[PDB]
From a paper:
Next, we recombinantly overexpressed [name] in suspended HEK293F cells to biochemically study the enzymatic properties of [name]. The conserved core catalytic Glu483 residue was mutated to Alanine (E483A) to avoid auto-cleavage and serve as the loss-of-function control. After the proteins were purified to homogeneity, cryo-EM was applied and a final 3.8 Å-resolution half-density map was obtained using a similar strategy as for [name]·[name]. The map revealed an extra component in the structure, which was then identified to be the co-purified endogenous [name]. Besides, Cys120 links to Cys652 of [name] and locates at the [name]–[name] interface. The interface of SD with [name] is similar to that with [name] where Cys120 of [name] is linked to the same Cys652 of [name], and the interface of [name] with CTD comprises a hydrogen bond involving Met1518 and π–cation interactions involving Phe1481, which also resembles the CTD–[name] interface. In contrast, the PD from [name]·[name] complex is only attached to the SD without interacting with any other domains. The K128BP5/K120BP4 anchor residues interact with Asn683 and His781 of [name], both of which are exactly located at the interface between [name] (or [name]) and [name]. Thus, upon the formation of the disulfide bond between Cys169 of [name] and Cys652 of [name] (or Cys120 of [name] and Cys652 of [name]), it is expected that the binding of the anchor peptide would be prohibited.
Originally discovered in the circulation of pregnant women as a protein secreted by placental trophoblasts, the metalloprotease [name] ([name]) is also widely expressed by many other tissues. It cleaves insulin-like growth factor-binding proteins (IGFBPs) to increase the bioavailability of IGFs and plays essential roles in multiple growth-promoting processes. While the vast majority of the circulatory [name] in pregnancy is proteolytically inactive due to covalent inhibition by proform of eosinophil major basic protein ([name]), the activity of [name] can also be covalently inhibited by another less characterized modulator, [name] ([name]). Here we present two cryo-EM structures of endogenous purified [name] in complex with either [name] or [name]. Both modulators form 2:2 heterotetramer with [name] and establish extensive interactions with multiple domains of [name] that are distal to the catalytic cleft.
Numbering used by the authors:
A (entry chain C): 42 to 213
B (entry chain A): 1134 to 1361, 1371 to 1390, 1405 to 1536
C (entry chain B): 13 to 364, 378 to 384, 389 to 1111
Amino acid sequence: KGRLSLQNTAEIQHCLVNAGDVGCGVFECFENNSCEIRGLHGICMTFLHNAGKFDAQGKSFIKDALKCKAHALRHRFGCISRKCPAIREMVSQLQRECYLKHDLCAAAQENTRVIVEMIHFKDLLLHEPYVDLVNLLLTCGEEVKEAITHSVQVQCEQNWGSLCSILSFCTS
Amino acid sequence: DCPELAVENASLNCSSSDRYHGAQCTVSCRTGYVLQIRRDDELIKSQTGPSVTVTCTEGKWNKQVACEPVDCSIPDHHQVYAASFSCPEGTTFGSQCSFQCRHPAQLKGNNSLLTCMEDGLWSFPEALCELMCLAPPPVPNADLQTARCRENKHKVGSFCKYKCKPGYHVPGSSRKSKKRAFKTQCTQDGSWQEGACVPVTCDPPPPKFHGLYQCTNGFQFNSECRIKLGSNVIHCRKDGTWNGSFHVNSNLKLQCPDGYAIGSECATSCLDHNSESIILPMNVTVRDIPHWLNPTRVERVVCTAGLKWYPHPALIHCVKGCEPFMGDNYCDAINNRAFCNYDGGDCCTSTVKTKKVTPFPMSCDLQGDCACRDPQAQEH
Amino acid sequence: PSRALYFSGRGEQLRLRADLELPRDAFTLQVWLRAEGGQRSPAVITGLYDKCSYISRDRGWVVGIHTISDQDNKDPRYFFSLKTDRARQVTTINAHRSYLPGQWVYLAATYDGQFMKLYVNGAQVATSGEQVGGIFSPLTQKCKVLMLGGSALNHNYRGYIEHFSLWKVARTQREILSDMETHGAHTALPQLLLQENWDNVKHAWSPMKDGSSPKVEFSNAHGFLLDTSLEPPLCGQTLCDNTEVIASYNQLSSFRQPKVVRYRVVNLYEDDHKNPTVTREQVDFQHHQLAEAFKQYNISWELDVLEVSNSSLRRRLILANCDISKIGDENCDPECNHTLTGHDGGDCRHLRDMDCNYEDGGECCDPEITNVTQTCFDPDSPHRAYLDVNELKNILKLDGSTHLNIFFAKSSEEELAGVATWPWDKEALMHLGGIVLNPSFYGMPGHTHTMIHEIGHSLGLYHVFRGISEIQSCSDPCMETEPSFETGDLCNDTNPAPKHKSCGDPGPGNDTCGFHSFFNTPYNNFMSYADDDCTDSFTPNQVARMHCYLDLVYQGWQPSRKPAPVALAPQVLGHTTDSVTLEWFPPIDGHFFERELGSACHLCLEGRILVQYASNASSPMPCSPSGHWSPREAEGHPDVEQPCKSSVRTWSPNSAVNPHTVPPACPEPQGCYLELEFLYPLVPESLTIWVTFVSTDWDSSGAVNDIKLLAVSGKNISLGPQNVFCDVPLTIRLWDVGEEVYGIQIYTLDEHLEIDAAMLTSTADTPLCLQCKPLKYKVVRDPPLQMDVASILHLNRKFVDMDLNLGSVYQYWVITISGTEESEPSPAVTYIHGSGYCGDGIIQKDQGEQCDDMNKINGDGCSLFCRQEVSFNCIDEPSRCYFHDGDGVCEEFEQKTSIKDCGVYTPQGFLDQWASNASVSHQDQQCPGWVIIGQPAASQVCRTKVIDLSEGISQHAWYPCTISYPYSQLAQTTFWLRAYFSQPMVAAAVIVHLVTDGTYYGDQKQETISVQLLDTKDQSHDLGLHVLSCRNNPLIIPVVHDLSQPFYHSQAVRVSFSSPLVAISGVALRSFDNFDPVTLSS
Ligand SMILES: [Zn+2]
């Protein structure tokens, strides 16, 4: 399954050049791929689904971050090597450099509760962009990291009991 | 032995004298009548055409043919333009239909009957309802430059130029530039398109003697403005020229340098910069505004004669101000109002380059808060 | 003289002046037009539109060019629409063929009051009888206007208009044919309304007030009176697959004279002259065996062994059948499986350094560590182990025009050799073409005959099993079930054979789609896959093709100075009481000038016109900043077998990418481009581009975004976007180009556009063909002419003689001399001065003339060999012809052929019975239930995504009318057609005739109907479900029954469906006319 050949490249390219960068149409076109890189569309839907709880700084960040992600994906999906590690590398690189230059740390520091009550733990174990947002989110504030780990510890009891004995078994 | 068969509206040109087993007879319908076949008993068929052959079998005929008349359509359109069709008999062959024109359409032609001809279609209309627009309504404060427009005979799509009389103008230009020429043309319905000249509003005074002003006619024409040397009477002439200028809160905060003294503008802003102050003196609060209302921006209250009697900083209401989301192809339900310029037209499909509307929250309903409520779009 | 209007697409159109009384009841258009390559989709030629109305703007008539498949714009046909003021539906009449973009077409459409007809080049093509009455009322006479070359919505026309003519009465086909031969020199008649030859446009025509009148040129419609172009058959490829050119090489024996054909052997050595690819005794044994098998066929081979020493090429593996894409692709293949290919890079081994090299990052490929030839298989390495032969010919860059090149290649497959090049390929004479062989089989005594098989593929002979084994589908245009000159191998002597390896006739099998027992199969022939012993000789109809491609394509190989003969007999055009006029074809290779080497004389045409293809092609790389790769498949003459299906022999913007790379989209403001360059830069006159494949949608209206002509002085003259077609080559006429053009640049925005070739036609008298001496034809007679007549040489092809006698026969043949050397004579034409010929107009069926008009033109319904065309019928003594598949009248011959015009074809062992007293459910005033009775008319065409059914369909069909579109989709109801029958017979097949498939314009989901069956005093016997198709428009439903269960006398058939759009015209019941299984099993 190491090649995106099984899903027509033209099918994902024609949809990309047909869609617009303003909405979630790019990630909607992108999700049906031969590799399993699903999860950008869910991030777009969750960010444009709970926009009411975000402040003006947060809504401006969400608008500009989804705009940059859509435009950068349509821009650098042109010429790339066709292998799933390269697709993962370009997706994670574009997502990281999109979140770092639009002040994700500022949006974490402003309204932390909305951005950390959106963990989606069950979705995380099978969506790499969710893991990307998690490992970029915690580097801003220490109380943000402690709150999101406190939420994950309850979500262990929701989902998996072994993680509560694995992750707590540190520095002892 | 078969009975003798007679079929209506046809020609039974057959000579089966003995109607035994094999009485070969032929049936052909007349002109303007098509053939219907409701068979009884048959093995093989052949393409006879407009006629048919009917055979005797066991004392009965193998086919039950009937030459039903052709059906012209009920005339809805495509025959006479802008007319009502009243067929008194029906829509079969030989029927004739009568049509009468609408009220503003004269008729030319002697014969005004449509005949359902032998081809199954209506005949050619010998008279066509000539569409001519009538005399225009005489719009006041206008000059009838075209001499033919005072008559009643005008073709559809005529160009009558009406020039407004001095002191009046067609709307569209402000008090700086004067335009008084506009075009009114006959529509395809037959009525003239509406257009009128409004009077030129006399120029507003400086705010030094405003509030205590008593103009003779106000914002109408020839209004002399004078409060209860210099300029004792202000003549609002045809050009609207002001000959002489007038001669002698808890939330909202304004720090004027002069204060009680006159002559200085004050910085007008609320406690938080996210809110915008507007002048709402007619008992309308912050949340009581509708979306189609268009309040004005806050004017910096210069101190007039006496105490300020201009809308008080209290009458001026700090409302939910605009946010920097204008023209980014995103519709905002908060800025879906006429106060913040309808978010730059982003909430209306006719002013978006992507020809689409995307509400910022997924839940927002497309016919609710984030709907195109702008009448200046292509939705109306 | 005669002047014509060149209409561009830029907006030039005209309008008839107000002083002309437009035709009201009956009219006849007669226009000589020469359309260009790619028009617009609805593009019109002459219309009569409504300009004072707004309720309906589709009144009047319009003649133009429009594609019949508007969803895809695949094939463009001439059309003639008409909608009178009385009628309610505009009906179009098309042509029978995609139009020719370079021929003058006498398009003429008539309408009398009942039948409107369209005449393309004199033959009646399609006729519809739906429009009735006059086309407008006389009250609105002043309102109708007539437009030429366009409409108010700007359906502009790109091409010529030569002699416009409009009539006040309808003229039949005998008057149309008389107007073709007399051109425009016509006298005054009361019926003749407007007869315009463009000497004064402003007297009768006025242009648009904003646009410009089109420019008036000089052109002649009567340029040829004998058509020199012969179409190859439906599964041929060249001029010598034609039936009457290969036959002239079979009856005659002076066309099979001894020919010495040169060939070379590419022998590779190292840098010390000691180790060969083929030994000297292998070459010596082969050549004496090669000339042994061809000395009985007048073909001799002159051998010139070329030895090229290169240790880089010699030491590495050379392979022929191994593609380069499958080396990178992980799908396995037998053609690339070697130790020097890495076992396809590990993609064929069962296990999925010598074993760790499977695609060590340049460690095993750099020469400083190990040898490159041991363990390097990188497909983008500068040095690798496998070498494709198409790269090897690029490395050598040999000469193919003066020799036949034989290369060598080791292959893992090796059941055959490498792929030989056919003579009709673009590399037939280029350096990339030749024969690739196995070097360890060439000259070995067991496999000597595999070189003769590869030679015959290179000289135009197909396999004997091409008509049986190499059949991709049994619905093929040609499949050799009967020996013929136009089916399969195109040889009458070769009986059909399947793919066999054993000698003798094969055993029977079900692999063959249409035969079971093959007798006298050519086991002995070289073209079979038999072994060395059982292959001995060629059939004598396979030496007519071999002696033909050595005249057509391979004239340069043989050192004989004898020119190519005129392969067709002279044709008689007309005669009088004293003289007979005859013309003949140009010689078979097509060259109109003497073969002078080192010049342009192999490219000029008749009249000093240089026609050349693209010599050098370049295009920027998509994934590189300054790549500039050179495409090759967009250079030569256009070779695509299917001109609308995407192929591999074209240039695509996404063809330049690596197979392991996502292709980038082309840039916005200019697009990706292809830069072609021509060998001889000339002042251009026309430019034709073979755009083969276009994606189904485009953003801009034209698929080709921009075309910029380069120049020697650098002035890039630009041309606008053009609307291209899939089938028809795009053709552009270039005015005012005063500078010489050495190449074009074709900017495009479509990602999957497939440009195939290009052609730059020079001007009328080019300054490069001026040194080419023309070849002269001499004509001899069997009673010989005088010395004053027979001595002179005719530069033209037209010859007349005066001394004739009214009784004696005369045989004429024409030789084609170039200089001193005189070629072989043409086949003779037996002419009698009293009797007729094949242009007399008196059909004489004793000589085999099926039809006889005076045309001598293949485009009509009667060919120039007195043979009627494919799907035509000629019905007069001067043999006016018509197209009978689309007409509404069934004939005696048409019953076995046209199912769509003469009803359903009942098999000879069966009998059809159509329904009577058929009852439905949703009977209404709009759609009653008596329409199902009897045989339906088959003239109702299928509905492709029908949106509305408000027309007159229910008078000749049945669809439900009480339940409309929204209630049928929501509530999910059902409708049934409870059809009865009259004579109780058993059921063998149930036929249901549908006027539509039920497919909606919006809803694309397929819908299925049910074909039940009812009988006397029992329940049912279900037959199943079937989906609806237009090509299966009579939907035959085969009855399933077991012989153990006793039979049932069928009485009724019920058809049920839930979708509202399925319309039934009539059901049937096929039974046995031989025996009745009820009184048999009583
Ligand atoms: Zn072969």
